[PDB]
Symmetry: C3
Subunit: 184 residues, 3 copies
């Protein structure tokens, strides 16, 4: 008949880029950022990791290398052997997230698998030492280190644990990722 109001479009372009992270010693989410095979995630996920294992929604499974992390922003960067065509998380550094914007929270809890929740940008600004993004989309261990995107699928932030949920603005998460790629 007609067309149901839906944010499925955003799911198809963003969700395949979000990933499951495992420990395989003798669990959380992550986000493929670029073709080079760099993935963002959370420290509390990969701490004391023995072997890091990444699993995509297309069925591919890799062993990840821990590039570097940042206790301050709780973020961590992994590195997998990028092969032929990787799903990457849509990014627009020219986009200015506005408060009230619709956002989808994407994460693959070890229980249910990939789960999309819906809310809006509740607030932004600074609250710490040196920048956060608040949202009423459910944000727990199940989707921590996951993506947070607008109705267009553009990456707004990386779900974090710093009725209200938090994310790290994609603009900051980028900078942090880039610096962690440093190799003194």
């Amino acid at each position: 008949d007609e067309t149901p109001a839906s944010y499925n479009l955003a799911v198809r372009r963003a969700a395949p880029a979000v990933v499951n992270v495992y420990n395989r010693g003798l669990l959380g989410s992550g986000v493929i950022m670029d073709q080079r095979g760099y993935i963002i995630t959370n420290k509390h996920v990969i701490n004391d990791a023995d072997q890091i294992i990444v699993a995509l929604q297309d069925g591919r499974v890799f062993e990840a290398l821990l590039v570097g992390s940042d206790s301050l922003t709780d973020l961590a960067v992994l590195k997998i052997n990028a092969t032929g065509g990787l799903p990457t998380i849509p990014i627009n550094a020219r986009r200015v997230p506005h408060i009230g914007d619709v956002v989808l929270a994407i994460g693959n809890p070890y229980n249910l698998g990939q789960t999309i929740t819906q809310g809006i940008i509740s607030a932004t600004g600074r609250i710490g030492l040196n920048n956060f993004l608040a949202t009423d989309a459910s944000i727990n261990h199940g989707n921590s280190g996951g993506a947070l995107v607008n109705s267009l699928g553009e990456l707004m932030g990386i779900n974090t644990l710093s009725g209200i949920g938090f994310a790290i603005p994609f603009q900051l998460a980028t900078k942090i990722m880039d610096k962690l790629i440093r190799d003194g």
Copy 2:
């Protein structure tokens, strides 16, 4: 002046079909499925029921007959004496629910009466023995056995208790209802 974003349309066509269920010995929700007077609900609602009483939003009140239930899917089917014109829950078996679709949860808790909550389809797939639908719309005893419909009002599922809520896909709930109408 202008027109507020609203999913009221879906409410007008679906909500009148959702019903209050009572015990009247010496409480939950249900859904009128067809003109014949068949209503879907939950087992944990009608278990050990003495007299089942159905109440519509138009003010009509019937005594319901328990056709049959299914402990596996927690569903149950009731039967009331369908009179002149019943409100039935819109159904489209040609509709494929997509993840991210907007959905409304409809249920009449014994406290507040009919209550509509809003979310999206978080996830689908299988997780049990032989099929579920996950959503971030509030789903509790207040709306259990209630309807879950898209922005068009089309039935997506039957609220169940198997920050995340669950429903039984309308495609499966149909089959289950049909089989329960069996009378060895």
Copy 3:
């Protein structure tokens, strides 16, 4: 590229009118209602207040006078010295809030500052002595006494504490405010 689904418009026209309320003896939210400088809030906020202090999002800070309150509806009315141009909360007394309508909850918790959450009108009707509005938007002490507006920004209600949140219909809140301006 394109335009993200967003209720930011409603934020820009309504949010500047919502206010922080402080005690400054030796905390909650409020809503500027009219140019005269009348502000609505909650009793449990200004009870036993020594000095009431109002703070706008534009940086202006006033000392408020308690006009009057109402234990029944938990509302309270303050009065600040309206100067040149005040931000007032959009009001449409010709608008009929429908169930399913999108609504934004606006409040400035003492912790995070102004926070917008999103939901819909779950239910209305009466439930008390002499009229409420239910919604699945988060409603806590952080946004109590705050505004609740539709996607157009029009005031629907005043967040109250009477998974479900409550507000006082703007039509009633108006009448109550007007009567409290009485001075026997």
